[PDB]
Write a protein that holds these residues in place. Structure first.
Motif, PDB file in Angstrom:
ATOM      1  N   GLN A 128       0.770  -1.346  -0.212  1.00 55.38           N
ATOM      2  CA  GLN A 128       0.076  -0.061   0.041  1.00 55.38           C
ATOM      3  C   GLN A 128       0.826   1.071  -0.134  1.00 55.38           C
ATOM      4  OE1 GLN A 128       0.739  -2.044   2.853  1.00 55.38           O
ATOM      5  NE2 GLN A 128      -0.313  -1.173   4.452  1.00 55.38           N
ATOM      6  N   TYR A 129       2.095   1.112   0.241  1.00 52.20           N
ATOM      7  CA  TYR A 129       2.983   2.407   0.338  1.00 52.20           C
ATOM      8  C   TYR A 129       3.872   2.553  -0.931  1.00 52.20           C
ATOM      9  CZ  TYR A 129       1.803   2.314   5.187  1.00 52.20           C
ATOM     10  OH  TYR A 129       1.160   2.453   6.448  1.00 52.20           O
ATOM     11  N   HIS A 130       3.630   1.563  -2.050  1.00 50.04           N
ATOM     12  CA  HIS A 130       4.400   1.705  -3.144  1.00 50.04           C
ATOM     13  C   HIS A 130       4.338   3.132  -3.883  1.00 50.04           C
ATOM     14  CE1 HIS A 130       5.389   0.254  -7.568  1.00 50.04           C
ATOM     15  NE2 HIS A 130       6.416   0.485  -6.859  1.00 50.04           N
ATOM     16  N   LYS A 131       3.143   3.604  -4.208  1.00 52.72           N
ATOM     17  CA  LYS A 131       2.950   4.764  -4.921  1.00 52.72           C
ATOM     18  C   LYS A 131       3.217   5.918  -4.027  1.00 52.72           C
ATOM     19  CE  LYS A 131       0.034   2.352  -8.322  1.00 52.72           C
ATOM     20  NZ  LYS A 131       0.946   2.462  -9.559  1.00 52.72           N
ATOM     21  N   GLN A 132       3.400   5.816  -2.779  1.00 45.39           N
ATOM     22  CA  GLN A 132       3.759   7.015  -1.999  1.00 45.39           C
ATOM     23  C   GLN A 132       5.266   7.059  -2.206  1.00 45.39           C
ATOM     24  OE1 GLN A 132       0.827   7.315   1.072  1.00 45.39           O
ATOM     25  NE2 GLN A 132      -0.024   5.564   0.589  1.00 45.39           N
ATOM     26  N   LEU A 133       5.982   5.905  -1.928  1.00 52.00           N
ATOM     27  CA  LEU A 133       7.382   5.941  -2.233  1.00 52.00           C
ATOM     28  C   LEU A 133       7.736   6.365  -3.519  1.00 52.00           C
ATOM     29  CD1 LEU A 133       8.650   2.615  -0.471  1.00 52.00           C
ATOM     30  CD2 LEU A 133       8.983   5.111   0.294  1.00 52.00           C
ATOM     31  N   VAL A 134       6.815   6.216  -4.455  1.00 48.91           N
ATOM     32  CA  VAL A 134       7.370   6.483  -6.024  1.00 48.91           C
ATOM     33  C   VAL A 134       7.016   8.238  -6.231  1.00 48.91           C
ATOM     34  CG1 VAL A 134       6.538   6.261  -8.509  1.00 48.91           C
ATOM     35  CG2 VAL A 134       7.070   4.261  -6.993  1.00 48.91           C
ATOM     36  N   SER A 135       6.020   8.589  -5.704  1.00 52.37           N
ATOM     37  CA  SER A 135       5.630   9.964  -5.700  1.00 52.37           C
ATOM     38  C   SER A 135       7.133  10.750  -4.959  1.00 52.37           C
ATOM     39  CB  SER A 135       4.459  10.298  -5.214  1.00 52.37           C
ATOM     40  OG  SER A 135       4.523  10.423  -3.541  1.00 52.37           O
ATOM     41  N   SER A 136       7.779  10.061  -4.005  1.00 51.11           N
ATOM     42  CA  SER A 136       8.792  10.827  -3.205  1.00 51.11           C
ATOM     43  C   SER A 136      10.142  10.389  -3.758  1.00 51.11           C
ATOM     44  CB  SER A 136       8.613  10.570  -2.046  1.00 51.11           C
ATOM     45  OG  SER A 136       7.572  11.017  -1.259  1.00 51.11           O
ATOM     46  N   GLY A 137      10.160   9.971  -5.061  1.00 49.49           N
ATOM     47  CA  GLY A 137      11.338   9.391  -5.807  1.00 49.49           C
ATOM     48  C   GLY A 137      12.048   8.478  -5.302  1.00 49.49           C
ATOM     49  N   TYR A 138      11.509   7.571  -4.334  1.00 45.77           N
ATOM     50  CA  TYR A 138      12.139   5.925  -4.017  1.00 45.77           C
ATOM     51  C   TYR A 138      11.338   5.216  -4.852  1.00 45.77           C
ATOM     52  CZ  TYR A 138      13.874   8.962  -0.304  1.00 45.77           C
ATOM     53  OH  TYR A 138      14.534   9.997   0.265  1.00 45.77           O
ATOM     54  N   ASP A 139      11.918   4.981  -5.948  1.00 47.25           N
ATOM     55  CA  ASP A 139      11.190   4.146  -7.133  1.00 47.25           C
ATOM     56  C   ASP A 139      12.102   2.953  -7.405  1.00 47.25           C
ATOM     57  OD1 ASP A 139      12.655   5.759  -8.769  1.00 47.25           O
ATOM     58  OD2 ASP A 139      11.277   6.434  -9.604  1.00 47.25           O
ATOM     59  N   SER A 140      13.232   2.671  -6.912  1.00 46.90           N
ATOM     60  CA  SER A 140      14.052   1.707  -7.083  1.00 46.90           C
ATOM     61  C   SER A 140      14.682   1.093  -5.981  1.00 46.90           C
ATOM     62  CB  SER A 140      15.251   2.135  -7.988  1.00 46.90           C
ATOM     63  OG  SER A 140      16.313   2.419  -7.301  1.00 46.90           O
ATOM     64  N   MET A 141      15.065  -0.127  -5.960  1.00 41.14           N
ATOM     65  CA  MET A 141      15.967  -0.682  -4.930  1.00 41.14           C
ATOM     66  C   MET A 141      17.193   0.254  -4.626  1.00 41.14           C
ATOM     67  SD  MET A 141      14.116  -3.418  -3.830  1.00 41.14           S
ATOM     68  CE  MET A 141      14.977  -4.280  -2.581  1.00 41.14           C
ATOM     69  N   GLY A 142      17.974   0.511  -5.406  1.00 44.34           N
ATOM     70  CA  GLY A 142      19.041   1.317  -5.034  1.00 44.34           C
ATOM     71  C   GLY A 142      18.957   2.646  -4.500  1.00 44.34           C
ATOM     72  N   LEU A 143      17.665   3.211  -4.942  1.00 41.01           N
ATOM     73  CA  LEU A 143      17.483   4.487  -4.179  1.00 41.01           C
ATOM     74  C   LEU A 143      16.874   4.339  -2.814  1.00 41.01           C
ATOM     75  CD1 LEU A 143      15.748   6.475  -7.335  1.00 41.01           C
ATOM     76  CD2 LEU A 143      18.107   6.630  -6.435  1.00 41.01           C
ATOM     77  N   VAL A 144      16.072   3.308  -2.841  1.00 41.50           N
ATOM     78  CA  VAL A 144      15.285   2.854  -1.162  1.00 41.50           C
ATOM     79  C   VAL A 144      16.197   2.789  -0.349  1.00 41.50           C
ATOM     80  CG1 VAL A 144      14.239   1.256  -0.139  1.00 41.50           C
ATOM     81  CG2 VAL A 144      12.937   2.493  -1.816  1.00 41.50           C
ATOM     82  N   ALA A 145      17.489   1.982  -0.541  1.00 39.99           N
ATOM     83  CA  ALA A 145      18.545   1.546   0.252  1.00 39.99           C
ATOM     84  C   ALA A 145      19.066   2.778   0.983  1.00 39.99           C
ATOM     85  CB  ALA A 145      19.685   0.936  -0.535  1.00 39.99           C
ATOM     86  N   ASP A 146      18.825   4.047   0.562  1.00 36.16           N
ATOM     87  CA  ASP A 146      19.431   5.335   1.108  1.00 36.16           C
ATOM     88  C   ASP A 146      18.029   6.005   1.902  1.00 36.16           C
ATOM     89  OD1 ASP A 146      22.343   5.210   0.417  1.00 36.16           O
ATOM     90  OD2 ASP A 146      21.526   4.942  -1.598  1.00 36.16           O
ATOM     91  N   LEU A 147      16.950   5.684   1.869  1.00 39.03           N
ATOM     92  CA  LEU A 147      16.087   6.488   2.520  1.00 39.03           C
ATOM     93  C   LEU A 147      16.114   6.409   4.253  1.00 39.03           C
ATOM     94  CD1 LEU A 147      12.750   7.161   2.886  1.00 39.03           C
ATOM     95  CD2 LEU A 147      12.135   4.603   2.918  1.00 39.03           C
ATOM     96  N   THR A 148      15.582   7.219   4.649  1.00 36.47           N
ATOM     97  CA  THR A 148      16.158   7.766   5.982  1.00 36.47           C
ATOM     98  C   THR A 148      14.818   8.157   6.933  1.00 36.47           C
ATOM     99  OG1 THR A 148      17.597   8.993   4.592  1.00 36.47           O
ATOM    100  CG2 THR A 148      17.901   8.826   7.175  1.00 36.47           C
ATOM    101  N   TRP A 149      15.059   7.877   8.209  1.00 38.37           N
ATOM    102  CA  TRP A 149      13.941   8.152   9.134  1.00 38.37           C
ATOM    103  C   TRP A 149      13.219   9.387   9.041  1.00 38.37           C
ATOM    104  CZ3 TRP A 149      12.676   3.850  11.858  1.00 38.37           C
ATOM    105  CH2 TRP A 149      11.372   3.936  12.656  1.00 38.37           C
ATOM    106  N   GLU A 150      13.722  10.535   8.619  1.00 37.81           N
ATOM    107  CA  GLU A 150      13.091  11.748   8.618  1.00 37.81           C
ATOM    108  C   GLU A 150      12.000  11.958   7.356  1.00 37.81           C
ATOM    109  OE1 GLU A 150      15.956  10.741   8.936  1.00 37.81           O
ATOM    110  OE2 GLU A 150      16.928  11.741  10.293  1.00 37.81           O
ATOM    111  N   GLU A 151      12.305  11.508   6.307  1.00 34.79           N
ATOM    112  CA  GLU A 151      11.530  11.597   5.071  1.00 34.79           C
ATOM    113  C   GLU A 151       9.845  10.947   5.461  1.00 34.79           C
ATOM    114  OE1 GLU A 151      14.888  11.002   4.940  1.00 34.79           O
ATOM    115  OE2 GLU A 151      15.396  10.621   2.742  1.00 34.79           O
ATOM    116  N   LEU A 152       9.922  10.194   6.395  1.00 33.80           N
ATOM    117  CA  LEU A 152       8.750   9.322   6.394  1.00 33.80           C
ATOM    118  C   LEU A 152       7.391   9.976   6.491  1.00 33.80           C
ATOM    119  CD1 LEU A 152       9.783   6.154   5.997  1.00 33.80           C
ATOM    120  CD2 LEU A 152      11.199   7.420   7.477  1.00 33.80           C
ATOM    121  N   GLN A 153       7.482  11.052   7.216  1.00 32.55           N
ATOM    122  CA  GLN A 153       6.190  11.696   7.661  1.00 32.55           C
ATOM    123  C   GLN A 153       5.741  12.285   6.092  1.00 32.55           C
ATOM    124  OE1 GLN A 153       3.759  13.978  10.744  1.00 32.55           O
ATOM    125  NE2 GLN A 153       5.596  14.793  10.806  1.00 32.55           N
TER     126      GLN A 153
END
Lengths: 140, 140
Positions: free
Chosen positions: A87-112
């Motif tokens: 259910q979070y795929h398209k939220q992650l994609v609208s924020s630019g985390y649309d690949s494995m390689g970019l998700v690996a650098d997602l951080t606790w503060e972006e989440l909100q």
């Protein structure tokens, strides 16, 4: 047997379940079977042409893949499906985390503003990120 | 509910199962719970000190980890356990495939003197390798 009862069930849907042990002795399970070829069936001793023709045909109808059995997600949506969080795929994609390689650098503060607000989904995802990073550095 | 019945079972082993919905509404499942802290329990509304003390204590006794829920193997043995092939770990290690990063370059011809001879275990493993490679190049 645990995947044996999965084979025996599927082979029974066309009365060929006496081949169950053929797949067991060869180490196969259902998701691996779904990717066999006719020559693979011959190799494991399915030699009668009438039965090998029918098992092949019944395998193409097996549409359950793709990261089973490997459990290596190749793309982002697969991985959010390993976890229980598609259910979070398209939220992650609208924020630019649309690949494995970019998700690996997602951080606790972006989440909100991505929109992951249940703390359990928060923690589950960031543990997945953390150890996804741990796996990239694993290649040197 | 599917992981709900896993929480409700575990919470019942000490009569605190009326907290099941607390973990559900927060998105938690059992493996994620096993990594919560006291402040995490407070955050999801476990505020009574008598119960939060007891749930914390009962969590340290939870010894089921580590690639659940993430399904990202960090080290080689974890991954051969995702797959059903831990019996081959020490054959892979005696042949110099003792890390994720090296396994990703294992090839179909090595298999015979490593000792993977059941063709189903052969195929399952090499599909895991193939798509493990596909995941490394995924980082650019």
């Amino acid at each position: 047997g645990k995947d044996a009862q999965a084979i025996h069930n599927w082979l029974s849907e066309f009365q060929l379940e006496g081949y169950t042990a053929h797949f067991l002795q060869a180490g196969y399970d259902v998701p691996t079977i779904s990717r066999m070829t006719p020559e693979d069936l011959t190799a494991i001793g399915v030699t009668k042409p009438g039965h090998r023709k029918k098992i092949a045909s019944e395998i193409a109808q097996l549409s359950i893949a793709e990261w089973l059995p490997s459990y290596i997600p190749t793309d982002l949506l697969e991985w959010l499906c390993a976890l229980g969080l598609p259910q979070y795929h398209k939220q992650l994609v609208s924020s630019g985390y649309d690949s494995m390689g970019l998700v690996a650098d997602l951080t606790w503060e972006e989440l909100q503003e991505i929109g992951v607000n249940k703390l359990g989904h928060q923690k589950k995802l960031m543990l997945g990120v953390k150890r996804l990073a741990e796996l990239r550095r694993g290649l040197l």
